[PDB]
Design an enzyme around this catalytic site. Structure first.
Site, PDB file in Angstrom:
ATOM      1  N   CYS A 164      24.257  12.974 -40.624  1.00 20.60           N
ATOM      2  CA  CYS A 164      25.037  11.946 -40.700  1.00 20.60           C
ATOM      3  C   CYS A 164      24.581  10.736 -40.129  1.00 20.60           C
ATOM      4  O   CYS A 164      25.265   9.480 -40.529  1.00 20.60           O
ATOM      5  CB  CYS A 164      26.441  12.083 -39.671  1.00 20.60           C
ATOM      6  SG  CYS A 164      26.864  14.044 -39.830  1.00 20.60           S
ATOM      7  N   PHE A 393      24.768  16.285 -37.354  1.00 20.04           N
ATOM      8  CA  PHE A 393      24.496  17.754 -36.900  1.00 20.04           C
ATOM      9  C   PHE A 393      23.031  17.790 -36.459  1.00 20.04           C
ATOM     10  O   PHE A 393      22.105  16.940 -36.921  1.00 20.04           O
ATOM     11  CB  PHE A 393      24.548  18.454 -38.363  1.00 20.04           C
ATOM     12  CG  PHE A 393      26.013  18.650 -38.670  1.00 20.04           C
ATOM     13  CD1 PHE A 393      26.816  19.608 -38.629  1.00 20.04           C
ATOM     14  CD2 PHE A 393      26.803  17.438 -39.270  1.00 20.04           C
ATOM     15  CE1 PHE A 393      27.958  19.740 -39.075  1.00 20.04           C
ATOM     16  CE2 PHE A 393      27.818  17.522 -39.715  1.00 20.04           C
ATOM     17  CZ  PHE A 393      28.816  18.475 -39.477  1.00 20.04           C
TER      18      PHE A 393
END
Ligand SMILES: [K+]
Ligand SMILES: [K+]
Lengths: 407, 398
Positions: A164, A393
């Site tokens: 992300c 993550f």
């Protein structure tokens, strides 16, 4: 040391294929989320996505000599870069220059092409079915490789990947290259394809929204008590990061100056954020910034655990005295590799056009956000300094702070 | 400006699973290339590889909780990192520290896992078949994320990918982070899985060796007139890059100082990359570990660039790829490690399998037999597909 400014932007997203379309959507609070028949057909539980609806097929928008090497991530990033180059006013001698580089990434490369190739290899089509352009379509660096050649990039050329946080880290690193005196211009951004091949991995871990398939525009709802996962999206974005004196020397339009950049790691939990690494990341990006943060584009993806960890981090940094807050993901979905650049662009447009995009679909605010300045209706306001968080993550964090340039 | 030194290393490669094994292979000119039944069974033309030969299954080497999230690139990088941490002598509070980071990349991430997930969806097991650990296995940044969590990294954490140049850019960026004063320690390296899923893409573009399948040890032959493509390899490598005063203060063992780093793009790019890495370096380049992957065009392009920078007055030259194959994401760190071992042990590894030197290398100082020599400054080139270039220059610390 050297200062960096953003002088051009380009974007392909679920809420618009250029900055004019995106600006309008942000002002309207328009959702880009729609029903995903492909996901239902694939046997997934999440049947919603933030799809890119291009005006034409890629073969009608990109030269075939360039297009033959690309996966969708590269197509999106390329269209975004063309827009950014036009917007920046850069000449060919500045785009292709020893001191002009490219730092662009993707969170997943191209599972669709990778799978297409492996399927072909297991049929009589064999190696001819794979084709000779699969390496640039399927390798992790595909998005930088596919753009460096057509634009004749001579400076740095590589991809940064970090789920992300991918394109946020790309922009921050562009600041670093300018600070080190290594480059005068760095095209930074990212791209991400939208496909069941990759989305099913997220659904299999329970990360995607599945309880709002019948009302897609209500699925992504960051900070709402009834959130149930993020809505996966695709797209691309590019910003032209430029050394200050170089931009001034050519009469460039300056959207903002990159005044802060934080990059930290949680060093805990593989999939969800811990908040402590996020706190350090925000503090690092705010170091030396002599103005308050007027607006913050949160990471907030609409996951039950993720949203709460971020709110806890925000409270540790600002108490309830937060900047105005909104999650554009409630409208756009989570574009993974493209999220950081998309959100930096949404923030720059809010600064340039003096408004805060609303955080939609909040019917009942999460108790952890009570007291904070959450904006739920489009609001006109003079914004000087903005912050955008990207927590991916693997506990990887990035935060960018941008500020109007003082002539 | 802050200075960076390498104080620890770890490696999993086709020529050894630790530095002692790798050193012996380098000194003996031993090939790590073998016949790849997997590639033959897949329908590929190239049936050779630089396979990582771990004695045990990863489940016997890595904690079960950590291993569930990992693809093979991550497994190899993780094992390399364990070796590097041990070698470095760092304490737990230095490994897990706000000023200690991790920059590790992979060329492909995990094509095998991307495919495994999609295959599962197409069977009755569906989402259950895919399982909940596929994102960390298949995402591009898997190799940085799967190491950052278990080692409790608190500083930077991300991957840089640039094909053949991947781990070279990771090392160069570690130097930049030290230079910017942002980190005191950066664990830098890369990992790459070995699988037909990715290999066939290279075979599909005709980049892999296919004419020496019956004599695998002779397939990789950088600068030889009869070369016909590279030999794909896998593995992991990691180096501990540390700010100078910090290393000195704790009594670290210093392999070398990173005195140069170049990164450019073709859009002459190689020439500029080498020149950038050599800027300010006040000593001659004693040895150069070339990019030379054993491809017909690629090798000549590099030879041309070397000729532009050094004419015939070149440093001593060899391609360790002739022995190891091309480990893609792990190539940069592997070659940086081999070069550090040559500096530490005073020898030049041979460039093997050159039966007939390519006319474009005529006059250059190509080494073809292991040679004992005091090396002070070394250079390693990584020029990857997509026109991305990286060059590292390392030197003994005085
Ligand atoms: K954000
Ligand atoms: K090399």
């Amino acid at each position: 040391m050297k200062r960096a400014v953003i002088t051009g932007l380009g974007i392909v997203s679920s809420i618009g294929n250029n900055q004019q379309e995106v600006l309008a959507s942000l002002q309207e609070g328009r959702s880009g989320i729609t029903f995903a028949q492909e996901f239902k057909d694939a046997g997934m539980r999440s049947h919603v996505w933030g799809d890119v609806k291009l005006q034409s097929e890629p073969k009608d928008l990109i030269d075939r000599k360039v297009l033959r090497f690309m996966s969708d991530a590269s197509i999106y990033a390329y269209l975004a870069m063309q827009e950014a180059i036009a917007d920046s006013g850069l000449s060919d001698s500045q785009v292709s220059n020893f001191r002009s580089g490219l730092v662009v990434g993707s969170g997943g490369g191209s599972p669709r092409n990778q799978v297409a190739g492996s399927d072909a290899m297991r049929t009589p089509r064999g190696l001819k079915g794979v084709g000779p352009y699969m390496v640039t379509k399927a390798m992790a660096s595909g998005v930088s490789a596919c753009l460096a050649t057509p634009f004749k990039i001579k400076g740095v050329n590589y991809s940064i990947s970090s789920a992300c946080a991918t394109s946020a880290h790309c922009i921050g690193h562009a600041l670093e290259l300018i600070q080190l005196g290594k480059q005068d211009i760095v095209f930074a951004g990212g791209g991400e394809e939208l496909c069941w091949e990759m989305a099913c991995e997220f659904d299999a871990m329970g990360a995607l929204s599945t309880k709002y398939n019948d009302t897609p525009a209500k699925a992504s709802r960051t900070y709402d008590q009834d959130r149930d996962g993020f809505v996966i999206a695709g797209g691309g974005g590019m910003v032209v990061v430029e050394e200050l004196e170089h931009a001034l020397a050519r009469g460039a339009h300056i959207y903002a100056e990159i005044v802060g950049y934080g990059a930290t790691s949680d060093g805990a939990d593989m999939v969800a954020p811990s908040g402590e690494g996020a706190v350090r990341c925000m503090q690092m990006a705010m170091a030396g910034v002599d103005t308050p943060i007027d607006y913050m584009n949160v990471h907030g993806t609409s996951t039950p655990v993720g949203d709460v960890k971020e709110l806890g981090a925000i409270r540790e940094v600002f108490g309830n005295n937060t900047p105005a807050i909104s999650s554009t993901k409630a409208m756009t979905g989570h574009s993974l590799g493209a999220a950081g650049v998309h959100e930096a662009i949404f923030s720059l447009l809010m600064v340039e056009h003096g408004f805060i995009a609303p955080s939609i679909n909040i019917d009942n605010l999460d108790e952890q956000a009570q007291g904070m300045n959450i904006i739920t209706e489009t609001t006109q306001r003079e914004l000087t300094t903005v912050m955008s968080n990207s927590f991916g993550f693997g506990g990887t964090n990035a935060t960018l702070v941008m500020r109007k340039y003082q002539k």
